[PDB]
Amino acid sequence: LAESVTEVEIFGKATSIDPNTYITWIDKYQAQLVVLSAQIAWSENVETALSSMGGGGDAAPLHSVLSNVEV
């Protein structure tokens, strides 16, 4: 789980995602851990976006999080 979340951090942070390496990550790690890694990455991303919303109070990084999830 630690290695999988470390790997999926790169995919989550970057808008451009390569299907080859993403399928490679899916294949490498178990379904339980793949789902867990996606959930942890999404939770952390939403929390950072919400903290930035609370601090700056301008624009919407949550829109970026939604766009990444849509991609």
UniProtKB/Swiss-Prot annotation:
Protein name: Cytoplasmic dynein 1 heavy chain 1
Gene name tied to this protein: DYNC1H1
Species name: Homo sapiens
Role description: Cytoplasmic dynein 1 acts as a motor for the intracellular retrograde motility of vesicles and organelles along microtubules. Dynein has ATPase activity; the force-producing power stroke is thought to occur on release of ADP. Plays a role in mitotic spindle assembly and metaphase plate congression.
Subunit structure: Homodimer. The cytoplasmic dynein 1 complex consists of two catalytic heavy chains (HCs) and a number of non-catalytic subunits presented by intermediate chains (ICs), light intermediate chains (LICs) and light chains (LCs); the composition seems to vary in respect to the IC, LIC and LC composition. The heavy chain homodimer serves as a scaffold for the probable homodimeric assembly of the respective non-catalytic subunits. The ICs and LICs bind directly to the HC dimer and dynein LCs assemble on the IC dimer. Interacts with DYNC1LI1; DYNC1LI1 and DYNC1LI2 bind mutually exclusive to DYNC1H1.
Protein family: Belongs to the dynein heavy chain family.
Domain notes: Dynein heavy chains probably consist of an N-terminal stem (which binds cargo and interacts with other dynein components), and the head or motor domain. The motor contains six tandemly-linked AAA domains in the head, which form a ring. A stalk-like structure (formed by two of the coiled coil domains) protrudes between AAA 4 and AAA 5 and terminates in a microtubule-binding site. A seventh domain may also contribute to this ring; it is not clear whether the N-terminus or the C-terminus forms this extra domain.
Compartment list: Cytoplasm, Cytoskeleton
Disease entry from the Swiss-Prot or TrEMBL record: Charcot-Marie-Tooth disease, axonal, type 2O: An axonal form of Charcot-Marie-Tooth disease, a disorder of the peripheral nervous system, characterized by progressive weakness and atrophy, initially of the peroneal muscles and later of the distal muscles of the arms. Charcot-Marie-Tooth disease is classified in two main groups on the basis of electrophysiologic properties and histopathology: primary peripheral demyelinating neuropathies (designated CMT1 when they are dominantly inherited) and primary peripheral axonal neuropathies (CMT2).
